[PDB]
RNA sequence: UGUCGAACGGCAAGUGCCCCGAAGCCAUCGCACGGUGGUUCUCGGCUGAACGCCUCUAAGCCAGAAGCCAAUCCCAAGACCAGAUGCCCACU
């Protein structure tokens, strides 16, 4: 075993990390995010004076190990997240039938995907703001937005699980809502 | 057909036989009715290390089978209900 384990992590200005039995809560500019982390069981401090965050193991194997850079990616996405915030767009990529998303507020409705006359209901949690790109700039995209990656991904993810081809060859019949580009609001 | 003398009333033929027949029973031979949530498999994903990259996993997650579990439904306190009540009586 290792005796000791570390990941530091250099705090920006703007944010303030705050770490209470495991329970990591990052404020910022735009908002407020709160990670609970009691099944790691890990040594997590904070200097403010010198803006760092730490984590340790000790007299730790590979498996407890592999959880320090997990720990501190986290704690990376919650800080990016407060920062900056999240913005992934989806592309609605159809070949012969136009796919029809309407967005109302937090709520997403998919029509004529393959022809279908199933309509595909979607509720976006208030956390995460969904919008769609008008067709002048860009076609069929859809932004959501919001300050945790965890909760702006999934959400991407549940909107392009929902339109998949069934029953059908999937190198040919390629059409659905794709996630293109991940970036920032800010 | 027999038989009380005939008619009437019947009667015997272990319900004489034939037709129609209520009520009851009964026929997918008629008619009515037959519901809802979870937890998960398989799988596909998210975030993400190990392993400066990567990766559905490894810590987390998300979806998710006619399986499975509960609701509904049938029996139900030897499930010994200090559940609630109506009357007496005992105690007081
Ligand atoms: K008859
Ligand atoms: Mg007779
Ligand atoms: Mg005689």
């Not at 209470?20 to 982390?37: E, F, I, S």
């Not at 008008?134 to 995209?141: A, F, H, I, L, N």
């Not at 069934?166 to 293109?180: A, H, S, T």
Request: net charge positive; hydrophobic share 35%; glycine share 6%.
């Amino acid at each position: 075993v290792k005796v000791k384990s570390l990941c530091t992590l250099q705090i920006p200005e703007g944010v303030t990390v705050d770490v209470k039995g495991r329970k990591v809560t990052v404020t910022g500019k735009r908002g407020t995010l709160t990670k609970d982390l009691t099944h790691l069981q890990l040594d997590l401090r904070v200097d403010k004076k010198n803006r760092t965050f730490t984590v340790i193991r000790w007299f730790g194997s590979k498996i407890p190990i592999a959880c320090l850079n997990t720990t501190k990616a986290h704690v990376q996405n919650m800080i990016t997240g407060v920062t900056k915030g999240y913005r992934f767009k989806v592309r609605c990529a159809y070949a012969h039938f136009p796919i029809n998303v309407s967005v109302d507020g937090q709520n997403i409705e998919v029509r004529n995907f393959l022809g279908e006359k199933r309509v595909r209901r979607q509720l976006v949690p208030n956390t995460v703001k969904v919008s769609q790109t008008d067709p002048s700039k860009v076609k069929d995209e859809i932004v959501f937005d919001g300050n945790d990656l965890e909760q702006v991904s999934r959400e991407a993810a549940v909107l392009h699980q929902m339109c998949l081809v069934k029953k059908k060859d999937i190198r040919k019949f390629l059409d659905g809502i794709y996630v293109q580009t991940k970036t920032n609001i800010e």
